Design an enzyme around this catalytic site. Structure first.
Site, PDB file in Angstrom:
ATOM      1  N   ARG A 169       0.835  -1.189   0.000  1.00 21.68           N
ATOM      2  CA  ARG A 169       0.000   0.000   0.000  1.00 21.68           C
ATOM      3  C   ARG A 169       0.874   1.244   0.000  1.00 21.68           C
ATOM      4  O   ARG A 169       0.521   2.275  -0.595  1.00 21.68           O
ATOM      5  CB  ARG A 169      -0.903   0.004   1.238  1.00 21.68           C
ATOM      6  CG  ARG A 169      -2.072   0.963   1.145  1.00 21.68           C
ATOM      7  CD  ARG A 169      -1.975   2.108   2.136  1.00 21.68           C
ATOM      8  NE  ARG A 169      -2.362   1.750   3.509  1.00 21.68           N
ATOM      9  CZ  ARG A 169      -1.627   1.025   4.358  1.00 21.68           C
ATOM     10  NH1 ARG A 169      -0.442   0.546   3.993  1.00 21.68           N
ATOM     11  NH2 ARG A 169      -2.081   0.775   5.586  1.00 21.68           N
TER      12      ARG A 169
ATOM     13  N   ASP B  57     -20.263   7.541  -3.010  1.00 27.37           N
ATOM     14  CA  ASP B  57     -20.739   6.437  -2.183  1.00 27.37           C
ATOM     15  C   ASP B  57     -22.038   6.813  -1.468  1.00 27.37           C
ATOM     16  O   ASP B  57     -22.888   5.960  -1.229  1.00 27.37           O
ATOM     17  CB  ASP B  57     -19.669   5.998  -1.175  1.00 27.37           C
ATOM     18  CG  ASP B  57     -18.587   5.124  -1.812  1.00 27.37           C
ATOM     19  OD1 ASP B  57     -17.683   4.654  -1.085  1.00 27.37           O
ATOM     20  OD2 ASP B  57     -18.637   4.901  -3.048  1.00 27.37           O
TER      21      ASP B  57
ATOM     22  N   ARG C 116     -24.622   6.611  -4.192  1.00 25.76           N
ATOM     23  CA  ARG C 116     -24.915   5.209  -4.466  1.00 25.76           C
ATOM     24  C   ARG C 116     -25.856   4.662  -3.393  1.00 25.76           C
ATOM     25  O   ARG C 116     -26.787   3.912  -3.689  1.00 25.76           O
ATOM     26  CB  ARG C 116     -23.629   4.387  -4.486  1.00 25.76           C
ATOM     27  CG  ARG C 116     -22.860   4.447  -5.787  1.00 25.76           C
ATOM     28  CD  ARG C 116     -21.634   3.569  -5.704  1.00 25.76           C
ATOM     29  NE  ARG C 116     -20.885   3.510  -6.955  1.00 25.76           N
ATOM     30  CZ  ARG C 116     -19.567   3.669  -7.033  1.00 25.76           C
ATOM     31  NH1 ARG C 116     -18.866   3.920  -5.936  1.00 25.76           N
ATOM     32  NH2 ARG C 116     -18.949   3.595  -8.206  1.00 25.76           N
TER      33      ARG C 116
ATOM     34  N   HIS D  84     -12.930   6.820   2.598  1.00 23.62           N
ATOM     35  CA  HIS D  84     -13.578   6.308   1.395  1.00 23.62           C
ATOM     36  C   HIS D  84     -13.303   4.827   1.190  1.00 23.62           C
ATOM     37  O   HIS D  84     -12.152   4.395   1.198  1.00 23.62           O
ATOM     38  CB  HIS D  84     -13.104   7.086   0.168  1.00 23.62           C
ATOM     39  CG  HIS D  84     -13.616   6.539  -1.129  1.00 23.62           C
ATOM     40  ND1 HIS D  84     -12.785   5.988  -2.082  1.00 23.62           N
ATOM     41  CD2 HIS D  84     -14.873   6.436  -1.621  1.00 23.62           C
ATOM     42  CE1 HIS D  84     -13.510   5.569  -3.104  1.00 23.62           C
ATOM     43  NE2 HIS D  84     -14.780   5.829  -2.851  1.00 23.62           N
TER      44      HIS D  84
END
Ligand SMILES: OC[C@H]1O[C@H](O[C@H]2O[C@H](CO)[C@@H](O)[C@H](O)[C@H]2O)[C@H](O)[C@@H](O)[C@@H]1O
Ligand SMILES: OC[C@H]1O[C@H](O[C@H]2O[C@H](CO)[C@@H](O)[C@H](O)[C@H]2O)[C@H](O)[C@@H](O)[C@@H]1O
Ligand SMILES: OC[C@H]1O[C@H](O[C@H]2O[C@H](CO)[C@@H](O)[C@H](O)[C@H]2O)[C@H](O)[C@@H](O)[C@@H]1O
Ligand SMILES: OC[C@H]1O[C@H](O[C@H]2O[C@H](CO)[C@@H](O)[C@H](O)[C@H]2O)[C@H](O)[C@@H](O)[C@@H]1O
Ligand SMILES: OC[C@H]1O[C@H](O[C@H]2O[C@H](CO)[C@@H](O)[C@H](O)[C@H]2O)[C@H](O)[C@@H](O)[C@@H]1O
Ligand SMILES: OC[C@H]1O[C@H](O[C@H]2O[C@H](CO)[C@@H](O)[C@H](O)[C@H]2O)[C@H](O)[C@@H](O)[C@@H]1O
Ligand SMILES: OC[C@H]1O[C@H](O[C@H]2O[C@H](CO)[C@@H](O)[C@H](O)[C@H]2O)[C@H](O)[C@@H](O)[C@@H]1O
Ligand SMILES: OC[C@H]1O[C@H](O[C@H]2O[C@H](CO)[C@@H](O)[C@H](O)[C@H]2O)[C@H](O)[C@@H](O)[C@@H]1O
Lengths: 332, 332, 332, 332
Positions: C106, C166, C169, C193
């Site tokens: 990451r 989001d 959605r 997020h």
């Protein structure tokens, strides 16, 4: 051969299709015209029909509007004293009404309006049996009931503007107070349209955060911010505007167009509008009051049942008794 | 018991009315999606249906668009391989076609496309007998003719995109040249879509001022300002975009949405589209070429008769003959 | 002598005023173009600039959009690899980022992105010192922080798309569940997020009616209607679209255009965006997470303080700690 | 701590940016309001300022408009008797004027208006030095000249509505006659606004096909279709509307909004508006007349030189002499 016959050639041998989203506005006074102008500028209809008993005024408004065709996406704008001009309308906005008189009882004013509707309504239904009636005429709650009775249409196709605009006014003032756009301030004003309307304090929020939670006294005498005065300004708005300019129209026009958009485009959006509330919140009389409803091209297809406090349900029961008080004395 | 049941109560007795301006897009490649995003962003429809031959891609595109519902005013977006999902469409945009193959003859390519249409056209008509077919697939002129024959629909309801975008591209280039917005620059590109299209120099103007009046050599070898290069840039546009990004999509999408708006809103606006021209400018066979037509909810109802130079008509006849030559060798 | 010269005469003495609402989109991949097509179709800007690292693709996309000028209300569309083309932008949407690589940590991925931003951010600020940066690249929360540090801009002018989509959605899924338009369904998804985002059940409502009031078990293991699956569907949305069509683009594009409109039109509307939250809900480090904010032409001017459950705040603190852990190991 | 202080937190330490597309409307009579309402519904401005000497009426209109905020995308609507409220406007529409009197010379009417402008104009320029003045007041041609003189602004920033609406009216009637949308019918009415205006027959066309070509007698006594009567109806439109309803407003409002759109969005579109024509078509006096111009955010930056017939240039020269006849007697 004319220039037109030499320039353009008709090549279709099929019958013309007819309008898809036609809208008719009954009464071309300021309110009617504000609604009409809002509907045109927002490109909502492919055909706008106007009707009114005052023939000259009607012809002048239609003419004035038609001259702006270049700036609009509306196929045609028609007007006439004969209701046949309104054939095949999807939505019919009724703004017509009786001109009040000197110390005349409320029952007589309503009855005068009923007599006006006894002509209008049946003529509307003759040419547009599958339409949706949107009554704006005051008193809206009872007049919507009248329209529903005289038309014979199912409840989903007879709607009253109710408190649609008063809730918008509430959200606006709420917005000016908090410093944010009204579309981000949520609050509902329901019940009877007017001084008896109900502000549902438990639903006032911004981004899902309710203000009552941050101020449990909100809306009462114990309030340190006096929110009750915001609702007071909403009910006194029309009056204030009229004291300043003699009439009120622009806000109502945008509100009606807003309602027509949800109907015409089958959005299935929630609006606080006047509808049959018999059986809701302890109301057992056949009256119309404003409650949040879902609007689409089939009309008012769904009703939201709000979680209301005893004190709130009571105000609704009381308004319903007042409306029914007048309604049982009417001759339809 | 349900949370939904306690919150919302259905109050309509009538069955739902169905969509009023449904649009279907066949093919979800770059072109189809660009058309889909253009139709949705411009609030042209209350129901968009997508259909293609690949299950996952189709389902992925629909889901992506559905996730954007909050920002749209379209009641629903549906997608399936089964054409029953396109029922009651007002307009059906057909973009499906055969991918080209090196070393292939023009006839093979066109037949391959016909083979595809023989499966697609009857499926569309079975579920939307009253739709208006808008063919965008290439070669558009011949394929529009094929859709007309296969559909059994009257000519007014089978339209080809033709030179609509090429005329828009021309107005854009003209605009960049004169320094003004393309909507103020008027010019028409007609005939066979592509290399053999015809730029009607006599119509090129700004505010009604003939540019050919100011420069009679316009468009010819004597032309000192080389306007012919503008028309050559138009025909070479797709090619240039293709070798830069790999394909074209945005301009075509905007172009189709423009045509849909005229049709859905019954604007009776003039567009240079592909339609049957037998009997015009000397063409004697049933072929489709682009000419200015009037479009509305009844489809292509009128054709404009331009006064063209015998030379201009000669190109149109040559095209007609080239097109007919291919059509007779096809197997419907 | 020129045809242009005889037709049009420049009559201004003043130098041209320049653009008033210029928008720049960095990166012309699927996401960037979707944002570009959404901004143009909604008439939000008078000048759109595109910038990327590949000459041909960049030039191809611009040309495609320019060919559609007739259908737009945008004065000009420009594109170049050189950032000077983005001069005087009001809003700059940043979508550029590093393509992921299997077996990668990451930290490497985030650093790779920082490396890209170190070249990009200063170039933007050099030509548009007064712009508002809208970061959409992932991981948006950490990358927005990086843009803030690298830009040297005040916090109000550096915004992350965060949970805006989001939340949209979620409202869409909620809408499909209750049968009403997503704009009438209210619900907020905040925080980090993605997987660790937080759905604030207390705010989920319709017309002000608390759905958690009707079902206190909402969102927990006792929840019989399994609302948690709705939030899980939100977080899994991108993943699902990705394995169906290969990537996501439309919903994000619509989402960015929505944010730009609030900013360009100074609407002061509430959006769940990524901004500095040090000092809120227990977060003690300089990290960016999503919370409801007010957006206008001055940027992100106000933040809304939601009353969250200690449990909800715990997730926000855990996120903050995870984000800070990565930020300290980065090399700006 | 108030609910607002507990709910919303200001996080910006930078000075607010200020409006980007502010519009001011001087005079809130019917014309002023029709323009204002058209500008709001078409989402053209982020701030609308209204001014008028009649304070109550002004406050009522503003109030009426502000109540519809929820249905608009305009940050704020301000009104006041003090011109400081109009600071930083991009465009200022002037509709104010002197109320005509009983058999009063035209020179005195104009002088009365000039006296009104001696107050208005300098107050507008004090708070918005970089604005663009759009004069709608009648007589428009001469009053635009007055505004230009009193303001001291360069010619590109002082425009008169001129024959913008009369050309739209022409296109509308042309459209009704041919059966096609007015946006597809091209025709220009130039010169002096009113009975002396000039219909340029050589530019009347549909899809680039001029009707004069198909009927060389078009517009003369020898016309078998009497097109001259179409222009006669355009000049008599305002009068007909006023005979029917007492005032005229809707068409003018859409026309003004149309002009503001091109200005605010820097469209660079061609509109027939009133501007300085000295040196054009044999006109050597310092008068304003309508001719096709290019409008953008820098104002009227370009003028189209039409190809006119001797008889046409003559009518223009004559109108210019009449205007100058009044202008040389004015005291500015
Ligand atoms: O009843 C037909 C008329 O209805 C409207 O006008 C009436 O309603 C107005 C507002 O409520 C009153 O001010 C007016 O006095 C009533 O007569 C409509 O505006 C008129 O044009 C219609 O003819
Ligand atoms: O004046 C414009 C149109 O008027 C007719 O249409 C109106 O009146 C009809 C009854 O006479 C209605 O059925 C129709 O819906 C109205 O729009 C006329 O028939 C049309 O040709 C005219 O264009
Ligand atoms: O899933 C969305 C809707 O799908 C149906 O509607 C589509 O498919 C039908 C054929 O199966 C068509 O007739 C219809 O017009 C399409 O919209 C389903 O019937 C609806 O209930 C669903 O909401
Ligand atoms: O035939 C169904 C498909 O039609 C289109 O795609 C094809 O046509 C494109 C344009 O010629 C080619 O570039 C592509 O290679 C062909 O496969 C549509 O775009 C596809 O989505 C449809 O499935
Ligand atoms: O080709 C279109 C325009 O390009 C210029 O403008 C862009 O590039 C500049 C830097 O080279 C920026 O400053 C400007 O803001 C961009 O729009 C060129 O200067 C213009 O004349 C061209 O029309
Ligand atoms: O870094 C410049 C590019 O950024 C974006 O593209 C990349 O980021 C995408 C999202 O993670 C990856 O899918 C893609 O593989 C990366 O290359 C932008 O979309 C590109 O256009 C920019 O050039
Ligand atoms: O001069 C300030 C006023 O200007 C407008 O009103 C005048 O112009 C109208 C239309 O030309 C006339 O009918 C009216 O008689 C003139 O006084 C504006 O409409 C008024 O509100 C302003 O106060
Ligand atoms: O009433 C709304 C706003 O009024 C002010 O703004 C107006 O008046 C100023 C002069 O006092 C102008 O500079 C400004 O452009 C006008 O809009 C007040 O300053 C704002 O805070 C109010 O929101």
């Amino acid at each position: 051969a004319s220039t037109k016959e030499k320039l353009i050639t008709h090549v279709s041998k099929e019958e013309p299709a007819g309008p898809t989203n036609k809208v008719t506005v009954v009464g071309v006074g300021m309110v009617g015209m504000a609604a009409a102008i809002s509907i045109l500028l927002k490109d909502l209809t492919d055909e706008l029909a106007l009707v009114d008993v005052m023939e000259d005024k009607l012809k002048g408004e239609a003419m004035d509007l038609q001259h702006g065709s270049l700036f609009l996406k509306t196929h045609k704008i028609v007007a006439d004293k004969d209701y046949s001009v309104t054939a095949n309308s999807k939505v019919v906005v009724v703004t017509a009404g009786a001109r009040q008189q000197e110390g005349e009882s409320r029952l007589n004013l309503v009855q005068r309006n009923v007599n006006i509707f006894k002509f209008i309504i049946p003529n509307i239904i003759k040419y547009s049996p599958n339409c949706i009636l949107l009554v704006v005429s005051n008193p809206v709650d009872i007049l919507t009931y009248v329209a529903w009775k005289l038309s014979g249409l199912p409840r989903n196709r007879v709607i009253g503007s109710g408190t649609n605009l008063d809730s918008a006014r509430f959200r606006h003032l709420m917005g000016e107070k908090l410093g944010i756009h009204p579309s981000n301030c949520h609050g509902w004003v329901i019940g009877e349209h007017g001084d008896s309307s109900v502000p549902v304090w438990s639903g006032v929020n911004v981004a899902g955060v309710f203000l009552q939670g941050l101020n449990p006294d909100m809306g009462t005498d114990k309030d340190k911010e006096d929110w009750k005065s915001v609702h007071k300004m909403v009910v006194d708005s029309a009056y204030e505007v009229i004291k300043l300019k003699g009439y009120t129209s622009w806000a109502i026009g945008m509100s009606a167009a807003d309602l027509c958009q949800s109907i015409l485009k089958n959005l299935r959006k929630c609006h606080p509008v006047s509808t049959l509330v018999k059986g809701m919140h302890g109301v057992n009389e056949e009256v119309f009051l404003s409650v949040p409803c879902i609007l689409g091209n089939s009309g008012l297809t769904d009703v939201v049942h709000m979680t209301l406090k005893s004190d709130e349900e009571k105000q609704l029961v009381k308004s319903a008794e007042t409306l029914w008080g007048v309604q049982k004395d009417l001759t339809l």
